[PDB]
Structure formats: C-alpha cells, structure tokens
Amino acid sequence: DSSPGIWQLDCTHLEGKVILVAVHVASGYIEAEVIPAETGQETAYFLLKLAGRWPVKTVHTDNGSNFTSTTVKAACWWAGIKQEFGIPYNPGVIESMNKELKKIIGQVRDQAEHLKTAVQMAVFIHNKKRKGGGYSAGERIVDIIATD
C-alpha cells in the first residue's frame, strides 16, 4: 500500500454506464474513464494504456475475479505487470476515493453533455485542483516516481 509501482483498478457505475477507476496508491492520483462494457477486454486495454504512461509494477483490485480474464493476464504479461498481494481486503481508502470521485462528477455533471467528459473534468479536479505539504496528487505522483 506504499510501493510507488502499485495501482488499484475497480469499476463503478453511474447513469447506466461503467467507470473504470485506477488509483496510484502511494500518491492518491487517479486515472478514470467511462468504458463501453465491464469486461476483461476493456480492463486489459486500460492496463496497457496505463502502463505506457506510468511505471506500473503491480496491480490490485477490490474484485479479484476481475483479474481472472485471460485477456487481462495477457496484458499483464506483455507489459510486465504482476498482481499485488500486500493489500488486504476491507469488507477502505480506495473505495472512499472512488466515492469522492463520484461526488465531484455530480458537481460538474451539468457542465458537459456526456458523462465521459464530466468524468475527465472530475479527474482533473481531483488530481490538480484539490490540494491536501499542500501539494496536489499530480504533484505527489511525479515526485514519488522521480525519487524512485
């Protein structure tokens, strides 16, 4: 829950659509997108995209069955990603950040036609505008990774 290579991926639902949320656990930085279907294929695609942008070493999820997809495992394999086992399940920080992201989405929803755009507005607010040495999550992730 503190190595700089750990990301957590989960799905949540809004307006009948699926939002995939990835959290960089050490910093609190978020990546999220609306995806057309809650599937292993979309999970795998997202992992490939994420790993090309950030150094992804291990991945966790609050729904372990997500990672039983052979397409997910192939994306893993190709990108050199392993599964994270040092984070126990809380039947939660990451769950709460997901709930906070949904709150931000609601606050900006009427400023965009499509949910996908509101989600990106909320990610921007979460990573860049929120501050909590009073840096943003975007500042924290780059500092953590650069130091590593």
Return left, alpha or beta for 131; rule: phi > 0 is left, psi -120 to 50 is alpha, else beta: beta
Give the separation between CA 47 and CA 20, rounded to whole angstroms.
11
In the bound complex, what is the minimum distance in angstroms from residue 133's beta carbon to ligand 6XI? 30
Give the interface with ligand 6XI as residue ranges (CB under 6 A): 38-40, 43, 65-66, 68-69, 112-114, 117
Of all residues in this chain, which one has the CB nearest to ligand 6XI in the complex?
A: 40
**Is the four-CA dihedral 53, 59, 64, 67 of positive or negative sign?**
positive
Distance CA 44, CA 123 (A): 21
Nearer to ligand 6XI, 10 or 97 (CB): 10
Q: How far is the CB of 148 from ligand 6XI (least distance, A)?
A: 29
Angle at 52 between CA 46 and CA 56, to 5 degrees: 80
Q: How far is the CB of 46 from ligand 6XI (least distance, A)?
A: 10
Shortest Å, Cβ 140 to ligand 6XI? 25
Residue closer to ligand 6XI by CB (options 58, 69) is 69
Nearer to ligand 6XI, 110 or 133 (CB): 110
Closest CB to ligand 6XI among 58 and 117? 117
% helix / strand / coil in the chain, to the nearest 5? 50, 20, 30
